[PDB]
Design a binder for this molecule. Structure first.
Ligand SMILES: O=P(O)(O)OC[C@H]1O[C@H](O)[C@H](O)[C@@H](O)[C@@H]1O
Ligand SMILES: O=P(O)(O)OC[C@H]1O[C@H](O)[C@H](O)[C@@H](O)[C@@H]1O
Lengths: 611, 610
């Protein structure tokens, strides 16, 4: 069989090269495009199932491959030189319908995409039935087939309150009931009516949770600090590393601290262990102060969860349990009860603004025609680079210091959703799926790793994200900030030729002919490196809501095109299972022989030196 | 240009006729053959000939052959075939300390057998790496593009053996500044340094960016258990006015010491932040009825190479802490730039930090290649970067104090080796530095490990941990480290379709159809690599050793690829273009001279900025 596959591989390669439209200098590009699905299916071979051909055999996919072989080595500037108003034709704006005339604007023009490639990318949406999938997901159909679940984070922010049905019942009444419950608690805390066991108003909130129950609340509290009540300090314990709880406990006055235990399952080992430790340390502190423990936990601990039974066991009153539902994915849970810490920080009205921004982006996504659909366009630009240029990564570069946790947040949203190797129809993928997300807030990144983005050997798609207006007016800081935002994307695209560099070196003087000759390529910029520029008028709660929903929907479109399930996360189960067994073996002086020699050796090293 | 196509097809034909790849793996041979062609196509705009000095190395060609033969094997294959693989594929550097600390590397969970390992070591010989190392350590001007020495190792040279630059021993210079740092840090820590109204310093605000920011902040976070909690440390870096504004709101300005950290003292973000901080500080004193006479001299110090600009800012000569051109910014934690660290953790702990790097330096320069920890890290990285073709490198510290280590290594690695041209003026024919990413464990497990386990990219991972915690509570550290060991095991061994099926069938509650569809979605390929790095405890000495180890890994990789790890020309174009655009950011101003995107974006900003 293997010999037959080889003879076939060679036949397919010969045919592909004979039929390719690639320029004579670019034959290697046709080979790379041909070879991509072969290399993916080799790497995924231990899945032990057939390769999915449903995407790669789409007429549009064949056409995109042909267009890549033709255009993939062209500059980006070429398209601008050919169309003087390319910017107007390769950008679009979503109105946020707010009193401050806010918006989300996408400029996707600094890309290797011409009108033909763009038409064919839109045709891929049609051929893969993406618009019908979107309608099914929005209507509550159980599109998370692996877990037989609906996918309805959009219900959480459904301000229209049109019914959305799960198991024959409208979910909106319960969504709105929990929002009202959240409102009442946040109001009591913000107004100083919620008192601790010794009568102190709450001045500290400590969220305990991990992953989806941590990244969102923290990112949003950071992002929306200008809209917050500064009298209430927000803390986020997440690592099981004892350092995390210990350092946060050191920062708070426990008599005025509200603990929020955030866990969809309420069984995650890190979160439940942190919660039990926090409760133990809290009660011990009270006892040391001669303060009665009777009724203290009920005043100082609340829970955000789907599991009432587990919350009860912990000792939290059901009245202080904030419910959400199985159709709320953890990495999509900011909008739900999980956002309670956020609502305490910025207030109910601002939380509703946050929901409303997401809702407006939802309405745009579901209703706008494909050609004018901002999240679909984001998704297609991403696929062009991810699947045809073969870029492994995606940089997220927000030029707003409050947004410094956005890259980490989008890391979970994107990579945990679409880091998949098997399709919903039980096959292995033949195309690349989710990319690796990385990034830091600008301008800091410019002084850390943009060197590589400009001059290295990898093509890195970059999303530059900014606000036209600052919340903190000081000197010329915001103008300087945004001069960098605009300049970096210009620089990535246009580069700097050897001829330009040579002239500059000669004009600077002080160097020999040979010295200049060595130096020229080292100071040359290829250019032709792509970016998207995303702008809002101002980073308000509404704008942040729109931005996050925008990426949720980008991820939806990409997953659906690739044929994978964006909404499960099976890949975390093996590690949890293996860690349970190892934990039992972490005892001083215990010898271990049942694993591979590395795992055995590492555990024994730990067991021999741990004290 | 059809002659190039003809030749390409001939070369590919010959490569396939001679390849020893298994029948099922022809695509792997094609991928290997095609890699330099794709690199040189992508770097074509550099307009110079391709470097073949690396690809022509006999060891490079042999590694290519071994990749085509062994590249699709599981990782477990080599464990099954050698019962003590762990012993042969691990090593430890002794940190010579009273607490018996160490740096231990386990590189066994890799696609590397004895034959590949030997050939990787031969590559070190063939690229003259050991000789390069000696030249660099000796102060030779190996940063050829800038005609500079590269001597961050002199900064922590506790032995005080002479090291010469322009025929002069730099060690007396290094030691004088350390003593200067000692004196200031002691005055601050002892409450002797008073502000303009007589208050002891309780807040330190470092203003700096990149190399003048990431190291100091990373180290102050990493070494918090060894710090003076009476002194709050703050790090302003972004020009975004939010950064300075929020920090100013957290401090009492009457007891704040500002530290302006900038090698050039001309970086736009840092000098603008420093001028604004100076302004707000003086407005604050005035609002409190406090005299401004001599106030800047009392509250501002500088870490720099530029004495004139420091003088111009108003800082006294006694409070300028010098370092030197041969200290790269991303290698500068060990110099005057580390002043905020020394204030926070004290002179003695800062000396421990230097000592740890020094011991790693001694190991690096003296240990044989086969037992050289940074060289092995570099070689493992090159195997994946250049032969498997992985674009990234994950850095996963299982220590909450190390939460800024990935961002710090992002600069160290990517700004060093994110290069496309060689020192001899050619374009590279091989991939250079990978993209660094990561978050402290266990948090990353609940964020993005899903993709590391089940996605379509191979991602080399460095797992870094401490055997002992500084914060004993309950069973937290045992739980933390059970995850540390389990994740690397999981990545390697995966979970077969038969295992998955058995589990699903025992659990029940699903139709046959549901189970059939679910099995592939819950299968793990395994064969995904990792390094496990351990220290006994994350002390200042251990941190020093860890950073020095990565500095030297970067040195070795850069030297093998023939690039300059120590310059950074790639940041210049953006700075020039931003100064130009800044001139055009005025309300209502129309802009026509750029590309239509840059024009439109700027006009959008100018139309709606008010
Ligand atoms: O210390 P400075 O001279 O202010 O430079 C700070 C940083 O700015 C530059 O842009 C470089 O990217 C970094 O290598 C450097 O560390
Ligand atoms: O909210 P929890 O049930 O505690 O789960 C928190 C997190 O842990 C899991 O391992 C997943 O990786 C995440 O999808 C999830 O958000």
């Amino acid at each position: 069989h293997h010999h037959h596959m080889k003879d076939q591989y060679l036949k397919d390669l010969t045919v592909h090269l004979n039929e390719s439209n690639a320029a004579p200098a670019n034959t290697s590009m046709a080979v790379a495009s041909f070879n991509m699905p072969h290399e993916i299916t080799r790497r995924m071979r231990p899945l032990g199932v057939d390769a999915d051909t449903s995407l790669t055999s789409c007429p549009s996919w064949r056409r995109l491959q042909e267009l890549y072989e033709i255009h993939g080595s062209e500059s980006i500037l070429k398209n601008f030189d050919e169309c003087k108003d390319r910017f107007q034709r390769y950008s679009l704006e979503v109105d946020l319908r707010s009193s401050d005339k806010n918006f989300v604007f996408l400029d996707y023009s600094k890309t290797h995409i011409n009108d033909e490639i763009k038409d064919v990318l839109f045709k891929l949406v049609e051929e893969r039935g993406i618009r019908a999938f979107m309608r099914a997901l929005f209507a509550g159909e159980k599109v998370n087939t692996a877990e037989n679940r609906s996918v309805l984070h959009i219900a959480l922010r459904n301000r229209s309150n049109r019914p959305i049905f799960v198991n024959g019942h409208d979910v909106m009444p319960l969504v709105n009931k929990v929002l009202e419950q959240m409102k009442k608690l946040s109001e009591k805390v913000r107004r100083g009516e919620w008192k601790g066991q010794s009568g102190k108003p709450i001045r500290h909130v400590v969220n305990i949770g991990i992953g989806g129950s941590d990244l969102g609340p923290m990112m949003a509290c950071e992002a929306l600090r200008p809209f917050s009540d500064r009298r209430i300090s927000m803390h986020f314990v997440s690592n099981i590393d004892g350092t995390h709880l210990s350092e946060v406990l050191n920062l708070v006055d426990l008599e005025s601290t509200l603990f929020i235990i955030a866990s969809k399952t309420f069984t995650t080992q890190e979160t439940i262990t942190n919660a039990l430790s926090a409760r133990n340390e809290f009660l011990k502190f009270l006892s040391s102060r001669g303060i009665s423990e009777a009724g203290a936990v009920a005043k100082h601990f609340v829970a955000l969860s789907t599991n009432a039974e587990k919350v009860k066991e912990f000792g939290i009153d059901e009245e202080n349990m904030f419910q959400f539902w199985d159709w709320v994915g953890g990495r999509y849970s900011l909008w739900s009860a999980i956002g309670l810490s956020v609502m305490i920080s910025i207030g109910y009205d601002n939380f509703v603004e946050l929901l409303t921004g997401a809702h407006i982006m939802d309405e745009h996504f579901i209703n706008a025609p494909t050609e004018n659909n901002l999240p679909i366009i984001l998704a297609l630009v991403g696929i062009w680079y991810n699947n045809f240029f073969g870029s492994e990564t995606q940089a997220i570069l927000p030029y707003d210091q409050y947004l410094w946790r956005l890259p980490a947040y989008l890391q979970q949203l994107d990579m945990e959703s679409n880091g998949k190797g098997a399709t919903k129809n039980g096959r292995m993928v033949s195309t690349h799926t989710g990319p690796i997300i990385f990034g830091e807030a600008g301008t800091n990144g410019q002084h850390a790793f943009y060197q590589l983005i400009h001059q290295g050997t990898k093509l890195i798609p970059c999303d530059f994200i900014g606000a036209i207006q600052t919340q903190n007016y000081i000197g010329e800081h915001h103008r300087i900030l945004m001069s960098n935002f605009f300049a970096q994307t210009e620089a990535l695209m246009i580069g700097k030729t050897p001829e330009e560099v040579k002239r500059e070196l000669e004009s600077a003087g002080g160097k020999s002919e040979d010295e200049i000759q060595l130096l020229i390529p080292q100071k040359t910029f290829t250019g032709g490196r792509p970016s998207n520029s995303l702008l809002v008028k101002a980073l308000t709660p509404r704008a942040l809501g729109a931005i996050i929903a925008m990426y949720e929907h980008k991820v939806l479109v990409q997953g659906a095109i690739w044929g994978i399930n964006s909404y499960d996360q099976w890949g975390v189960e093996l590690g949890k299972l293996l860690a349970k067994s190892i934990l039992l073996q972490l005892q001083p002086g215990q010898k271990v022989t049942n694993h591979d020699s590395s795992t055995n050796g590492l555990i024994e090293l730990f067991n021999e030196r741990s004290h």
